[PDB]
A paper describes a structure:
In order to probe whether the differences between the active sites have an effect on substrate recognition, we used the ADPr analogues adenosine diphosphate (hydroxymethyl)pyrrolidinediol (ADP-HPD) and -monoalcohol (ADP-HPM). These compounds were originally designed as PARG inhibitors and contain pyrrolidine instead of the distal ribose as well as differing in the number of hydroxyl substituents. The inability to coordinate MgII could account for the dramatic drop in Ki and IC50 observed for ARH3. This mode of inhibition stands in contrast to the structural studies on ADP-HPD as a PARG inhibitor (Kim et al., 2012, Lambrecht et al., 2015, Tucker et al., 2012). In PARG, the substrate is bound in a strained conformation due to the presence of a conserved phenylalanine (Phe875 in human PARG), which forces the distal ribose, in particular the linkage 1″ carbon, toward the catalytic loop. This conformation is further stabilized by extensive contacts between the Phe875 containing loop and the pyrophosphate moiety. The strained conformation, however, brings the ribose ring oxygen into the proximity of the Pα phosphate, which could stabilize the oxocarbenium reaction intermediate and explain the higher potency of ADP-HPD, which has a positively charged pyrrolidine nitrogen, in comparison with ADPr. In contrast, in PARG, the C6-linked amino group makes an electrostatic contact with Glu727 and water molecules. For example, PARG is being investigated as a chemotherapeutic target and promising inhibitors for it were recently discovered (Gravells et al., 2017, James et al., 2016), but the overlap in function between PARG and ARH3 remains to be elucidated. PARG activity appears to decrease with decreasing chain length and only low activity against oligomers of fewer than five units could be detected (Barkauskaite et al., 2013, Hatakeyama et al., 1986, Uchida et al., 1993).
Numbering used by the authors: 450 to 523, 532 to 963
The structure:
């Protein structure tokens, strides 16, 4: 045999149908809202609040390109320079390189534009190139230069240990991302920077470097988005929430029972996870290498739903106890392949319903696993506890009862690029979801043996009525008996065989 095992997917909970009704949208101490809630209507472009541009240039807010404090030593206005540079007509790729470098002179040797030049000159056909420089690029410039009429309210940084939300319009995000494309955000470039060293890259200069064969596919994917959002203004909202928990369960003592499992070797988190909490296998610097050379699970999601990318403008590097939750991003592209075989396939028309805040009914959580360079390192209790607490923070929704929480749509978190063991991580996610009172929908991404192994272990543990704490104690025993005093690189016996023996022996 079967393509899926466990509980039928029809019997799992989904949004917004399992959704609480939303409370009224309102600005508060822990929620920044950048549009007029009183004027928010389905099918209408949201109105910025406030009506006129207000600037903050300080250690707690985004440094906007259009700030009067964005100055260049000649002090002149850098925003005036950006406007003059970008309002020239482009007919050849050198023109675009030269424009970006007019307000980035310190990087005129360091930033390579080979990928941009090759895309324009050596990938596109003539009519496609013409469309790019006659239509798409000038439309992008115009939405970028409208920034102070669109993003009128200062955007707070979602800094370390903040529990805070930002809700902004898809139109505001389009203007911001056009700016990132033209690399206009100040103080976000120097490799020896201080203020923003703990923030991800936002400006898109590394998208334009080198000769990776995947750069044309990343550019096709982003130009699909920019072509659609400059042609017809998008009408919905997107919320970005930083969440930080203080109190974690005492896992060894947790008496909660396991929840339900559906596990399948067909399908993906993004297509088969509708109405479910969709996991992003993140970097602690959210978005990973999306605007540089990365092209695995996180980067692909950030390309096909590009509104995710703007999280990099204001989300500080995640600590152990933190996650980011993004609600309302839209899917603009379809893809084939993965990593070095990734291709843009076509435009996607998102058919998601919107909630009462005009957000697409798509909820994504970024949780970063640890990057293990040795196999045995992940079985150390400290490290197991770390992964449990991370996943718990991602799954937990303080205030909300269990019957209003959708299933988690997840899979082989930490077990590709980050070197984790899928059988351990599967159990870690099962326990975290149990403590958060959510069911699990687990995609094994073509591994049919792994599907049968996860199913068999879950139903073994469930039938014996083992608690979260019972299971965690078995993890601690595997560590003590097979890993702690182990000389060799791999242990003598595997986790699942150990568990079956320990329980059946008792
Ligand atoms: N779309 C997908 N749906 C379900 N599973 C997927 C999907 N895409 C990839 N996978 C599976 O998930 C595994 C792990 O994906 P990776 O992206 O390598 O994740 P992980 O090891 O946590 O690496 C984290 C870093 C940090 C990110 O910025 C970039 N990659 C892959 O080896 C596949 O088996």
């Amino acid at each position: 045999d079967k393509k899926w095992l466990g509980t039928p997917i029809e019997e799992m909970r989904r949004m917004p149908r399992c959704g609480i009704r939303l409370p009224l949208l309102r600005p508060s101490a822990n929620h920044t809202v950048t549009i007029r809630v009183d004027l928010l209507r389905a099918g209408e472009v949201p109105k910025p609040f406030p009506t006129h541009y207000k600037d903050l240039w300080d250690n707690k807010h985004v440094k906007m390109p259009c700030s009067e404090q964005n100055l260049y030593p000649v002090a002149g206005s850098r925003w005036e320079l950006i406007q003059t540079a970008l309002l020239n007509k482009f007919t050849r790729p050198q023109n675009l390189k030269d424009a970006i470098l007019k307000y980035n002179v310190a990087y005129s040797k360091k930033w390579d534009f080979t990928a941009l030049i090759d895309f324009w000159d050596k990938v596109l056909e003539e009519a496609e190139a013409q469309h790019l420089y006659q239509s798409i690029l000038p439309d992008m410039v115009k939405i970028a230069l409208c920034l102070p009429n669109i993003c009128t309210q200062p955007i707070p940084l979602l800094a370390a240990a903040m529990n805070h939300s930002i809700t902004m319009s898809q139109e505001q995000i389009a203007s911001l991302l056009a700016n990132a494309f033209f690399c206009t955000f100040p103080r976000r470039n120097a490799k020896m920077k201080s203020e923003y060293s703990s923030y991800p890259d936002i400006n898109f200069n590394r998208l334009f470097e080198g000769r990776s064969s995947r750069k044309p596919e990343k550019l096709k994917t982003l130009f699909c988005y920019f072509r659609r959002v400059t042609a017809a203004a998008p009408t919905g909202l997107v919320t970005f929430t930083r969440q930080s928990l203080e109190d974690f369960p005492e896992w060894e003592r947790c008496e909660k029972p396991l929840t339900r499992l559906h596990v399948t070797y067909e399908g993906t988190i993004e297509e088969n996870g509708q109405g479910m909490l969709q996991v992003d296998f993140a970097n602690r610097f959210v978005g990973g290498g999306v605007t540089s050379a990365g092209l695995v699970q996180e980067e692909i999601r950030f390309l096909i739903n590009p509104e995710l990318i703007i999280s990099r403008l204001f989300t500080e590097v995640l600590d152990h106890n933190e996650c980011l939750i993004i609600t309302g991003t839209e899917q603009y592209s379809e893809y084939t392949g993965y990593a070095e075989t990734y291709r843009w396939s076509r435009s996607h028309e998102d058919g998601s319903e919107r909630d009462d805040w005009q957000r697409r009914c798509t909820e994504i959580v970024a949780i970063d696993a640890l990057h293990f360079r040795r196999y045995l390192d992940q079985f150390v209790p400290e490290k197991m506890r770390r992964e449990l607490n991370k996943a718990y923070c991602g799954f937990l929704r303080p205030g909300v009862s269990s019957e209003n929480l959708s299933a988690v749509a997840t899979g082989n978190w930490g077990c590709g690029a980050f070197g984790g063991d899928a059988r351990l991580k599967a159990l870690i996610q099962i326990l975290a979801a149990a403590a958060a009172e959510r069911d699990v929908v687990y995609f094994t991404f073509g591994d049919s043996e792994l599907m049968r192994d996860i199913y068999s272990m879950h139903i073994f543990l469930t039938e014996r009525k083992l608690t979260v704490g019972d299971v965690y104690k078995l993890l601690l025993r595997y560590y003590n008996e097979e890993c702690r005093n182990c000389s060799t690189p791999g242990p003598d016996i595997k986790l699942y065989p150990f568990i079956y023996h320990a329980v059946e022996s008792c």
